[PDB]
Ligand binder design. Structure first.
Ligand SMILES: [Mg+2]
Ligand SMILES: [Mg+2]
Ligand SMILES: [Mg+2]
Ligand SMILES: [Mg+2]
Ligand SMILES: [Mg+2]
Ligand SMILES: [Mg+2]
Ligand SMILES: [Mg+2]
Ligand SMILES: [Mg+2]
Ligand SMILES: [Mg+2]
Ligand SMILES: [Mg+2]
Ligand SMILES: [Mg+2]
Ligand SMILES: [Mg+2]
Ligand SMILES: [Mg+2]
Ligand SMILES: [Mg+2]
Ligand SMILES: [Mg+2]
Ligand SMILES: [Mg+2]
Ligand SMILES: [Mg+2]
Ligand SMILES: [Mg+2]
Ligand SMILES: [Mg+2]
Ligand SMILES: [Mg+2]
Ligand SMILES: [Mg+2]
Ligand SMILES: [Mg+2]
Ligand SMILES: [Mg+2]
Ligand SMILES: [Mg+2]
Ligand SMILES: [Mg+2]
Ligand SMILES: [Mg+2]
Ligand SMILES: [Mg+2]
Ligand SMILES: [Mg+2]
Ligand SMILES: [Mg+2]
Ligand SMILES: [Mg+2]
Ligand SMILES: [Mg+2]
Ligand SMILES: [Mg+2]
Ligand SMILES: [Mg+2]
Ligand SMILES: [Mg+2]
Ligand SMILES: [Mg+2]
Ligand SMILES: [Mg+2]
Ligand SMILES: [Mg+2]
Ligand SMILES: [Mg+2]
Ligand SMILES: [Zn+2]
Lengths: 95, 129, 43, 144
RNA sequence: GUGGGGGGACGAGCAGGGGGCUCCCAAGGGGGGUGAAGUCGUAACAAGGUAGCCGUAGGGGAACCUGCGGCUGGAUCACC
RNA sequence: GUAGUUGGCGGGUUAAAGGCCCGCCAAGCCGAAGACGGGUAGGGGCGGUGAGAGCCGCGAGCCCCGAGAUGGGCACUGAGACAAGGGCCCAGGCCCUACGGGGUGCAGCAGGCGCGAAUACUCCGCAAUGCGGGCAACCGCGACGGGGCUACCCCGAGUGCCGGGCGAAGAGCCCGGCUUUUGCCCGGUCUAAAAAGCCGGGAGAAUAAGCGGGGGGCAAGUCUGGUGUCAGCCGCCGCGGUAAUACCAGCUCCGCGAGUGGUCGGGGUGUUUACUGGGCUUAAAGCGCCCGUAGCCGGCCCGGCAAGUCGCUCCUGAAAUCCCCGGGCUCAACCCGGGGGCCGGGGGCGAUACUGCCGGGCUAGGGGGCGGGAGAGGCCGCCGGUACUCCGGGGGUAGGGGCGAAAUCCGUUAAUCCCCGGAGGACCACCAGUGGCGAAAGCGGGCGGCCAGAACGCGCCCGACGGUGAGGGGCGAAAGCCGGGGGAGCAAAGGGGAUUAGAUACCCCUGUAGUCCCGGCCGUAAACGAUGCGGGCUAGCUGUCGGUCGGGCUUAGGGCCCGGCCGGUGGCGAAGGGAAACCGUUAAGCCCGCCGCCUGGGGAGUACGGCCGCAAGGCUGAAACUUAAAGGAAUUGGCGGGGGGGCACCACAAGGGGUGAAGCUU
């Protein structure tokens, strides 16, 4: 049976996708079907009491987006296996 | 590409009647559409047939009465002889007393009942019930 | 496989005891339905 | 996916050609038209045939059942082909000998193929030396 | 009426090829497929324990493995 | 494909036209609307089956036409033959013979052998029906008629009836009364004569029932004996391995009955061939995509014809067969009389609604345009962006790299790391989206040039120019092939380090084709929306892209928001549809067209053949044989080296005591 009307990748009215490479992997997928979670990121986490407002310590915080496949995304808890009724509910992937 | 206007018009009535609509617009149109709708109105399957004048052939607006259980055009336009109309009668109609066929005979378009009284056959057009 | 063989061909047919049966003649078609009418429709 | 296809009033010839094209998809029609029944059947289109018994051979019933159905190997007189023929009835194989003419006939079953638990046998013996095997088995006659 | 030589159309038959159409027999092999479970692994089904499958190429006792491109019939209908 | 082949002209021959044949001239004739080749078959009336459409040929027997007389040819006579019981020659048999010769071929009626599963009397009459001959009378006829044999088709009957007892209400036995269809004998009639029939007479219940079945389908036994997964049954399902309703038997019952069974073939079965009337997302089934020839299907109005079409009538469509009605055999089967049909062909007269053709006119489908915008659409040229690898130099020592952990490996001729420069090939991060473009494949940096295709706006132009499209053509990922260039990273094959029972795998180091460019070939893919193309109709709500119009704002912008239309692209969901998942204005709904494909599984995308290719291979594509399921969707559970929650000293954590070792009891 055709699970998912989407086919698993929101491709659109085209024939082919450019595809990317999976971090921690390389099994990967096209541009759709690839998880692209973004996390805030910053070196030296909560040392801002003893750093930053101590000496000068101009600290930086770089938004980083990570790309994964279905294997890695399920492996790192970014993706669960939802029930059938819950498959159609659009929830953000905790950033 | 639009090929047969009579089948297009007859299916519009079937579609609009099944939604319980009061009227239906028909376009494009020919004399065969009009002469068929006159036979329909003569048997109480159709209300008033108003005509509109555009540059593109013209339109008919037909008031439906909920009197149609099914309708459609017989394709292809089969020739039929007078002695054969009984056989075609039981093909498209339920019961011996219910429903009519629309025949295009040399004297004009008439119901299959009026063709049987005249003792002539012709080219089959449609069925109503 | 199966423990059969061609050497046991018809083994059971010669093993049943031979009980003689009575002679019997069957009824004609008219007499049959007379019998069935008397035994089913009647008591 | 719509409007079966050649539906015109003057589409009679084309419609008949299209329907004749797909008759060959029917295995029954293709076999009858190509003369396949009378080219590979050992009986050669006949309902029965004569033959000479060569060796009493036993085939085993299929897996769920357990038995040794006792058949015989026959060579058809009219063809010379060798077929395995099932000898029915309890003790019916005992009325068979070697080098005796037997009338060979189809065993029934679906489509003229083998019967229920007997694998790969299409024929059964009906006559032995010009007398029916059921007659011998019932005692109504005796083998000559 | 004829008897010879010959020319003609029709044309058997016997000699030969030439082609197919068919059909048998043939030392040996070639890819197969059925039994009943004998051997070696465990490839498929669960994330089948290296997600699976399609085409192609190479490789290997064997199932199969690897490279490339594709698909989800995926274990995801879901980023900010 | 054809080469006397296709035609023309002049001749010959014929009873007669003709490439029928001949002399000359030309290149024509047939073909995908299927030539040619192969296979099969005598054609029709008709017959079987089905409620019908239809399917099949039992299209044997009877009637009409054809051809043949052992195979192949050629002539005599005759009105007519190139002649089944006439002729001649060759081939191939056989027969008699006095050896010099001479006959003969049963596909005539009987009959024999042979083959095969499979088959009648070497009988009677020219009386009926006809024919040849005769003025006639009449003669002849294996045509024909009659019977024989034969489970040939159809029809009507018997194998007792009435009452009673035993028996069971059954069968059967016995008793009392009745009848004689029928069997037997006789007479008349019939018949060419017999036979049978019919009429009449005699004795007499007296002379006469089988075939297949009882587990379900499917009517009939959980009665009994025997066997014990053996033997046997079984169209399918399925039984039998000790208590068999399925086997062998007894008893009993069931179906039909002078029949009843077995194997075949056809039809129904079967909407599994689908015109009526199937299906193709997932069950088998949409060609990877497109251009188009034949074909099929095609807008509106006006006038003409009357081809199709419709109505009437006529000449016909042999008889038999079929349907209805009447009559005659005792009814029946059957025979006779009459009407209809036997699906069609042609004639005449009428109608012109639709189709067809001809003519005139339109703009709604289509094409061609103009305007401002949109777009990773294509080809070509130039440039850039980081990143990477390598090379040269400077700083600085001794590690780096990699892993689950290591090792291989790189490094003390200075590495990894940092800085200054150079070279090179590939890619175009974020923005960026069920966003865009394209027929599909596919296309993602900027500028430019040459092209293409669309959408929107339009009182622009033509005037049906259209749809689909067998065959035919073109484009068509990756891998791969041919020849050249290039080669950073990656990486089939291979080399090594590990792991392992093994490890020719999974990991690591390394590594060559290949990946990239050019010219050509291949022509395949889960080439997928597993959903062919064109058109119309059928609630809506919501996101977004392009154009446009109206209203409100303006980073006064090609900008933003609200609403309408057109065109795309997602989600939910009317009606409706579906086996269900689900589709639902982007249909898998209601319709109109055309093309492709499917008809249980395996054998098998295999074999043979053909075509294509440098090759790999590709396209097209069976059958024998084997089999009773394979298969779709969904439900309950079970299970998982999937996820989540709860719980327990027959779990753990924190503890306490132990057992496991010695001797001994058990
Ligand atoms: Mg694709
Ligand atoms: Mg079977
Ligand atoms: Mg495994
Ligand atoms: Mg390998
Ligand atoms: Mg390697
Ligand atoms: Mg002449
Ligand atoms: Mg000629
Ligand atoms: Mg005869
Ligand atoms: Mg001859
Ligand atoms: Mg002769
Ligand atoms: Mg002969
Ligand atoms: Mg006579
Ligand atoms: Mg009878
Ligand atoms: Mg009693
Ligand atoms: Mg007599
Ligand atoms: Mg019996
Ligand atoms: Mg019994
Ligand atoms: Mg029953
Ligand atoms: Mg039974
Ligand atoms: Mg079907
Ligand atoms: Mg497609
Ligand atoms: Mg194909
Ligand atoms: Mg086209
Ligand atoms: Mg006419
Ligand atoms: Mg009559
Ligand atoms: Mg007739
Ligand atoms: Mg084509
Ligand atoms: Mg390539
Ligand atoms: Mg490497
Ligand atoms: Mg290299
Ligand atoms: Mg497909
Ligand atoms: Mg469906
Ligand atoms: Mg929906
Ligand atoms: Mg194929
Ligand atoms: Mg081949
Ligand atoms: Mg469950
Ligand atoms: Mg503890
Ligand atoms: Mg101890
Ligand atoms: Zn990954």
């Amino acid at each position: 049976p055709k699970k998912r009307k989407n086919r698993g990748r929101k491709k659109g009215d085209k024939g082919r996708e450019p595809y990317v490479y999976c971090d921690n992997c390389g099994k990967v997928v096209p541009r759709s079907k690839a998880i692209r979670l973004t996390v805030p990121y910053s070196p030296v986490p909560p040392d801002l009491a003893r750093e930053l407002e101590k000496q000068g310590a101009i600290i930086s915080r770089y938004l980083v987006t990570k790309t994964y496949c279905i294997n890695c995304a399920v492996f790192f808890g970014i993706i669960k296996v939802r029930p059938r009724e819950e498959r159609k509910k659009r929830v953000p992937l905790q950033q | 590409v639009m090929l047969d206007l009579l089948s297009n018009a007859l299916t519009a009535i079937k579609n609009a009647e099944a939604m319980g609509k009061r009227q239906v617009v028909i376009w494009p149109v020919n004399k065969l559409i009009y002469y068929t709708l006159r036979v329909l109105q003569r048997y109480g399957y159709v209300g008033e047939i108003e005509y509109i004048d555009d540059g593109r052939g013209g339109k008919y607006v037909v008031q439906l009465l909920g009197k149609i259980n099914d309708i459609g055009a017989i394709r292809p336009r089969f020739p039929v002889k007078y002695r054969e109309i009984v056989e075609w009668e039981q093909k498209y109609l339920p019961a011996r007393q219910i429903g009519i066929l629309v025949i295009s005979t040399s004297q004009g378009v008439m119901s299959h009942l009026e063709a049987k009284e005249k003792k002539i056959g012709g080219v089959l057009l449609a069925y109503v019930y | 496989p199966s423990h059969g063989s061609l050497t046991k061909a018809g083994k059971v047919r010669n093993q049943t005891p031979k009980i003689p049966a009575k002679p019997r003649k069957n009824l004609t078609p008219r007499r049959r339905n007379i019998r069935n009418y008397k035994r089913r429709v009647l008591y | 996916p719509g409007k079966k296809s050649p539906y015109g009033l003057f589409a009679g010839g084309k419609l008949k050609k299209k329907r004749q094209k797909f008759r060959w998809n029917d295995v029954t029609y293709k076999r009858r038209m190509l003369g396949l029944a009378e080219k590979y059947d050992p009986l050669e289109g006949a309902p029965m045939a004569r033959g000479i018994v060569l060796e009493k051979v036993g085939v085993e019933a299929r897996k769920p059942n357990a038995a040794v159905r006792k058949c015989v190997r026959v060579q058809l007189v009219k063809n010379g082909k060798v077929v395995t023929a099932f000898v029915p009835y309890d003790g019916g194989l005992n009325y068979i000998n070697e080098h005796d003419e037997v009338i060979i006939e189809r065993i029934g079953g679906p489509e003229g193929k083998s019967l229920g638990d007997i694998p790969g046998v299409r024929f059964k013996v009906v006559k032995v030396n010009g007398v029916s095997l059921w007659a011998i088995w019932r005692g109504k006659k005796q083998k000559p």
